[PDB]
Design a protein around this ligand. Structure first.
Ligand SMILES: Nc1nc2c(ncn2[C@@H]2O[C@H](COP(=O)(O)OP(=O)(O)NP(=O)(O)O)[C@@H](O)[C@H]2O)c(=O)[nH]1
Ligand SMILES: [Ca+2]
Ligand SMILES: [Mg+2]
Ligand SMILES: [Mg+2]
Ligand SMILES: [Mg+2]
Length: 166
């Protein structure tokens, strides 16, 4: 079966772990335990194809920015996550996409822009603003909530479908 190497990146606290754990383990992590670097692996059927998702849940704490080059090298596709109630996390996306872009020496790396926490009402990043960013990258924008499960499968499966276009 086909393996897909996914990597989840974004600022601290945007919900990278919560999203990954919701996808893989089907529950919502309420508490906030900052991540160093964890791996998750799960066999799933996507569009009729049995495949193995290998997902690297990375650190948003800038203290660990040194580890980015390593995982950006190995990853096949990147879930670039910000929170819709965290304007700064949205502005931070560019610096993640720039690094991925450099490391893969490519303007063409399978990526999905994800606006997480869409269950919360304190929105400061409007859908249209994120759509414009994703458009400029030539990638999809998808809103998610790790809490309600909204968009969670859509985000990760879309990332698989982007890798397949590569
Ligand atoms: N309401 C709501 N809270 C969320 C959502 N996703 C994450 N959170 C909350 O936000 C906090 C941080 O989540 P977490 O997944 O740990 O973020 P992270 O991006 O993995 N952090 P780090 O970069 O430090 O590893 C937690 O309290 C978590 O419950 C979401 O979709 N909705
Ligand atoms: Ca819980
Ligand atoms: Mg985390
Ligand atoms: Mg505004
Ligand atoms: Mg496309």
């Amino acid at each position: 079966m086909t393996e897909y190497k996914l990597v989840v990146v974004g600022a601290g606290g945007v919900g990278k772990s919560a999203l990954t754990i919701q996808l893989i383990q089907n529950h919502f992590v309420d508490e906030y335990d900052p991540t160093i670097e964890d791996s998750y692996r799960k066999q799933v059927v996507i569009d009729g194809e049995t495949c193995l998702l290998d997902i690297l849940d990375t650190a948003g704490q800038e203290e660990y920015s040194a580890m980015r080059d390593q995982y950006m090298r190995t990853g096949e596709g990147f879930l670039c996550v910000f929170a819709i109630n965290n304007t700064k996390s949205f502005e931070d996306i560019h610096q993640y996409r720039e690094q991925i872009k450099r490391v893969k020496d490519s303007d063409d790396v399978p990526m999905v822009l994800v606006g997480n926490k869409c269950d919360l009402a304190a929105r400061t990043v409007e859908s249209r603003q994120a759509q414009d960013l994703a458009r400029s990258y030539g990638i999809p924008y998808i809103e998610t909530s790790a809490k309600t499960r909204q968009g969670v499968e859509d985000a990760f499966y879309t990332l698989v479908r982007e890798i397949r276009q590569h």
